[PDB]
């Protein structure tokens, strides 16, 4: 009954793979990515398969899959 999931976070020309438990909020994972880009985590909108996600939620909330991708984008309400 697999407990961990491998996810990728990408912003175009840079990516980072992470392993985390299905039940763990994406917070740390987002902050980690934001750190290595030298950016405010509020500076970034995070998409999963077109869905806008917030640090409060877990892979199982979003019903994520092994090798799923989170895309990180700049700020806009557009956008």
């Amino acid at each position: 009954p697999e407990t961990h999931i491998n996810l990728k976070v990408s912003d175009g020309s840079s990516e980072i793979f992470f392993k985390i438990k299905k039940t763990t909020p994406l917070r740390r994972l987002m902050e980690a990515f934001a750190k290595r880009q030298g950016k405010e985590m509020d500076s970034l909108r995070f998409l999963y398969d077109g869905i806008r996600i917030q640090a409060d939620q877990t892979p199982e909330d979003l019903d994520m899959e092994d090798n799923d991708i989170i895309e990180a984008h700049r700020e806009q309400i557009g956008g």
Partner: peptide, 11 residues
Amino acid sequence: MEHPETSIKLE
């Protein structure tokens, strides 16, 4: 996440 079969996903 309740009824996941109705989801809409986009890449």
